[PDB]
Amino acid sequence: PISADFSEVENAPSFLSLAENTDEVLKPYTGLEIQTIITNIVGDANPNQSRIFDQDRLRGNQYSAGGLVTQNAVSAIPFTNLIPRTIRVGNILVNSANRLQITETNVSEYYSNPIIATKLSEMISDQVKNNQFSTWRRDNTSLQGFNAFDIATINTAILPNGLSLESMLLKLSLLHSIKAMNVDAASINRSQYQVIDHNTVPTIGAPAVVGVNNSPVFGEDCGGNNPVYPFGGGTGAIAFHVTLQTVPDERKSYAIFVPPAILQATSDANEALALFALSMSEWPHALYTVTKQTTDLAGANAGQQVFIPTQSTIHIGGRRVLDLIIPRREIAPNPVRPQAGPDATAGAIPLAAGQLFNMNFIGAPAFEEWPLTSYLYSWAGRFDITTIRQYMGRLATMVGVKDAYWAAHELNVALSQVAPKMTTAAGGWAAQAANSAQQSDVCYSSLLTVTRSAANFPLANQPAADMRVYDTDPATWNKVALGLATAANLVPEQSMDVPFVVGDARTSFWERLQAIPMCIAWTMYYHSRGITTLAWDNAYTDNTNKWLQKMVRNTFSTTQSVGTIIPARYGKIVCNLYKNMFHRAPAYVATSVGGKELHITHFERWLPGGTYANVYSGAGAVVNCFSPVLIPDIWCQYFTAKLPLFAGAFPPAQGQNSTKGFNSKQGLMIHRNQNNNLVAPYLEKFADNSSYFPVGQGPEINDMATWNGRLWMTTGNVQYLDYSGAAIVEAVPPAGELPVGKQIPLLAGENAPIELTNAATTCVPRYSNDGRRIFTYLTTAQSVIPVQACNRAANLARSCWLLSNVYAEPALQALGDEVEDAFDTLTNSSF
């Protein structure tokens, strides 16, 4: 919450009390909490009436330090899943001189929720089979579409993991988030076409065109019609078998049963084989683009920019050769529909390729492999989000897809909503230049720089992994999609129990708002202890200060117990800084060591390797200091139930008292080194007895003093020196300049932020790369009013927002269970 006076800066919760464990069961963060503040929609659903195109930013009055009120001053929503591979430089479109930002997961099978053979599986073994041991009979007890010698080779030795529908449901959770950009124009913001390319105005009118393999720079049309995989040059292979006898002799264990519940006479019914073959194989199969008509700032040069979404750059899968076994009607003996296959058509795209598809091959003979990047390229303009929604409802009737899609969905939001770093400026609204690394350099919500590609596409290098995600194995999928095994995370449901995000037009708006509390929780994690940006980068193996290696060691997921993931320590600190600070729990998955079942969130599955949230200067130079700051503060304050005390709104100037500090009555002291000219704030009592941290000590979490340090570097002329006033190794901003948010184009009657209002002031540097303590200093002449404001005998004029705090309770309808519809109050006893 933002502050009305100093008596609620002072009576704000601490960090240690707000990072404690919580035993409450909390509702999921739906993204509607930020929505019902920054838009005209407070109540309920609105089809096309609510113009979300214009409602894309934080708006409010501001109050300057000089006593003036700015009327309509805006802060951008700082997250988008769209990297502009065509940049508007000099009011005209040119190709990007920048590589594409790629991520990579760490897909591996772990001990999920345990699995058990059903009464059908004990029925096949006990009866039938066991009874063929006396009758000399080799009859067929065919289950629904498969041979008895196909079920008999699967009702066998079961792996003791249990499956997690996570990788296939992130691919479904991911192509959904791509294919939901072409829904309308007044349902997708214009700010999220302007987050990186800020010299750009997209248009109401023509919607976005979600294309595939048509990006104009650095390869990236990975076979525009001769398609390969983007990660690794190769085309894969798919084969549609009717028996396991046809799978040649080599694979036969990798063979995936397509269950007959996902293909019924309810849809196109042959697109569902492509969503199944796309969920089970590999992401990405192709490099999707989003092309939209844009215009420059005044509006002359209307062209079409090419974007590439971030979730088409996430390398997940490792299954490139699929052998799919198809249900054979009711019951038939083993044999162009040889054995009564319902279908296997190619698609809708003509696809002149290496096997030369013509326009749409209908073919399910015995072996006869196709390519897989080709077979998925043909079904790349057909995957609209309504079809994905009803496919999810057909999945939900046989397995439990409610909680696993929401965990996979905020996994998508965790590694897909990606934000440009910062720019250091004095006032408000600085950005970068065009055709430069600094405009396109970009970070996660975890304050962690996204790796861009090193060489031209399709890639042979395979960069380091970023996140540990699970996967469906084919061998357990073949028996849980067939009634032969069951678990507690796999209990089936109805299509009403599909989450609200699926098949809705408002996903590109909601998913960029779900990523803001992730960066608030990581932002408050990285700012309680200020280790700049250099003592985070080369911190994993520094032989100085064993404390710092323990910090970076524990933050990441590098431990195990039995064959399963032990989640990270200190990512539960971020999770508790999410549940306490937002009163809403993030979605976990299950992992079991043995018996004991414990929970791991995207807060606990990151991996080491990679630099952190850097800040740039006005001329593009690196200012690796402060702390890993991303989005501007007011996001890390206003949209918050309980923000810890060191991060706080400087309260408005009401009477004679505006902004004060914390003095030696709270256990603090002034540093006051060698020279008489520069003095430091009221830091801790340990600050004068250190000067360099001991090899197992770090910055003590004091929010009286971190407040009191950002209270001094808001003055506008500070230097970040030393215990003795000497320089540091770290790059310092050129003046009294702070990291400030990204500037987007304005509208009519709508202003830019004024002075340290769209800034990030909380990033107080306290721990240099060398292990020495960083002190913020002022001249003796220019520190009298800050020292007396700490002593409550003066006041400091600071700028603020003129908003008020509401923070409503959760709705739990979210446009996803509108079961009030009159035709099921009467079909209600039958459920």
Binding test (CB under 8 A) with a copy of itself, winner from 337, 402, 584, 642: 337
Q: Is 293 helix (H, G, I), strand (E, B) or coil?
A: strand
Closest CB to a copy of itself among residues 36, 782: 36
Is position 748 an interface residue for a copy of itself (rule: CB under 8 A)? no
In angstroms, the CA 784 to CA 794 distance is: 9
Dihedral (CA of 351, 354, 356, 362) sign:
negative
Q: 228-287: which residues touch a copy of itself (CB under 8 A)? A: 232, 250-254, 260-261, 264-267, 269
In angstroms, the CA 197 to CA 442 distance is: 12
Buried b (16+ CB within 10 A) or exposed e, 242-268: bbbebbeeeeeeebbbbbbbbbeeeee
Q: 67-126: which residues touch a copy of itself (CB under 8 A)? A: 69, 71-72, 106-109, 120, 123
Ramachandran region, residue 338 (left: φ > 0; alpha: ψ -120 to 50; beta: rest)? alpha
Binding test (CB under 8 A) with a copy of itself, winner from 91, 304, 461, 717: 461
Smallest distance from a copy of itself to CB 430, Å: 24
In angstroms, the CA 375 to CA 211 distance is: 16
Closest CB to a copy of itself among residues 136, 655: 136
Q: Which stretch in 81-89, 171-179, 333-341, 735-743 sits in contact with a copy of itself by CB under 8 A? A: 333-341
Binding track, positions 401-440, relative to a copy of itself; x by CB under 8 A: ----------------------------------------
Smallest distance from a copy of itself to CB 692, Å: 4
Q: 383-402: which residues touch a copy of itself (CB under 8 A)? A: 384, 386-387, 389-390, 393-394, 397-398
Q: 304-323: which residues touch a copy of itself (CB under 8 A)? A: 318-319, 321
Q: Using alpha carbons only, how large is the chain's radius of gyration in Å?
A: 29
Please report where in the chains the tokens 């080369």 appear, as a residue. Answer: 538
Smallest distance from a copy of itself to CB 339, Å: 11
Binding test (CB under 8 A) with a copy of itself, winner from 299, 350, 804, 812: 804
Is position 773 an interface residue for a copy of itself (rule: CB under 8 A)? no
Smallest distance from a copy of itself to CB 443, Å: 18
Closest CB to a copy of itself among residues 86, 580: 580
Is position 454 an interface residue for a copy of itself (rule: CB under 8 A)? no
In angstroms, the CA 370 to CA 505 distance is: 34
C-alpha pair distances (Å), 663 with each of 110, 562, 644, 653, 776: 52, 51, 19, 21, 16
Closest CB to a copy of itself among residues 588, 692: 692
Binding test (CB under 8 A) with a copy of itself, winner from 465, 535, 713, 774: 465
In angstroms, the CA 736 to CA 612 distance is: 23
Binding test (CB under 8 A) with a copy of itself, winner from 91, 304, 456, 560: 560
Closest CB to a copy of itself among residues 710, 773: 773
Q: Which stretch in 94-102, 279-287, 296-304, 564-572 sits in contact with a copy of itself by CB under 8 A? A: 564-572
Residue 11 DSSP one-character state: T
Closest CB to a copy of itself among residues 638, 712: 638
Smallest distance from a copy of itself to CB 67, Å: 13
CA diameter of the chain: 104
How open is the CA angle 637-640-642, to the nearest 5 degrees? 100
Binding track, positions 651-690, relative to a copy of itself; x by CB under 8 A: -------------------------------------x--
Is position 570 an interface residue for a copy of itself (rule: CB under 8 A)? yes
Smallest distance from a copy of itself to CB 814, Å: 10
Contacts of 648 (CB under 8 A, 6+ apart): 3, 9, 12, 637, 707
Smallest distance from a copy of itself to CB 805, Å: 8
Closest CB to a copy of itself among residues 7, 558: 558
Q: Determine the size of the site formed for a copy of itself (CB under 8 A).
A: 176
Instruction: Give me the helix-helix angle, 402-414 and 167-179, nearest 10°.
Output: 60
Q: Which stretch in 289-297, 620-628, 734-742, 814-822 sits in contact with a copy of itself by CB under 8 A? A: 814-822
Please report where in the chains the tokens 């609200």 appear, as a residue. Answer: 500
Other beta carbons within 10 Å of 316 = 26
Closest CB to a copy of itself among residues 436, 549: 549
In angstroms, the CA 609 to CA 233 distance is: 25
Q: Is 523 helix (H, G, I), strand (E, B) or coil?
A: helix
Smallest distance from a copy of itself to CB 363, Å: 12
Q: 520-559: which residues touch a copy of itself (CB under 8 A)? A: 529, 540, 542-547, 549-551, 553-554, 556, 558-559
C-alpha pair distances (Å), 224 with each of 68, 218, 346, 628, 815: 56, 13, 17, 39, 38
Smallest distance from a copy of itself to CB 791, Å: 6
Closest CB to a copy of itself among residues 299, 318: 318
Closest CB to a copy of itself among residues 586, 733: 586
Smallest distance from a copy of itself to CB 454, Å: 12
Binding track, positions 140-179, relative to a copy of itself; x by CB under 8 A: xx-xx---x---xx--xxxxx-------------------
In one letter, which amino acid is 809? Answer: E
Q: Which stretch in 83-91, 171-179, 191-199, 324-332 sits in contact with a copy of itself by CB under 8 A? A: 324-332
In angstroms, the CA 715 to CA 784 distance is: 12
Closest CB to a copy of itself among residues 106, 782: 106
Q: 686-745: which residues touch a copy of itself (CB under 8 A)? A: 688, 691-698, 700-701
In angstroms, the CA 83 to CA 311 distance is: 10
Q: Which stretch in 404-412, 442-450, 660-668, 822-830 sits in contact with a copy of itself by CB under 8 A? A: 822-830
Binding test (CB under 8 A) with a copy of itself, winner from 23, 24, 809, 821: 821
CA atoms within 13 A on the CB side of 36: 16
Binding track, positions 13-52, relative to a copy of itself; x by CB under 8 A: ---x--xxx--------------xxxxx-x-xxxxxx---
Q: Do 21 and 503 form a contact (C-beta atoms < 8 A)?
A: no
Closest CB to a copy of itself among residues 676, 830: 830
Q: What are the start-end ranges of the E strands in 66-171?
A: 69-76, 83-84, 86-89, 92-95, 103-104, 116-117
Smallest distance from a copy of itself to CB 485, Å: 13
**Last residue before each gap in the chain (C to N over 2.5 A):** 335
The token pair at 752 is 């830019």
Q: Is 267 helix (H, G, I), strand (E, B) or coil?
A: coil
Is position 483 an interface residue for a copy of itself (rule: CB under 8 A)? yes
Q: Do 699 and 775 form a contact (C-beta atoms < 8 A)?
A: no
In one letter, which amino acid is 787? Answer: V
C-alpha pair distances (Å), 393 with each of 169, 398, 401, 563, 619: 13, 9, 9, 32, 52
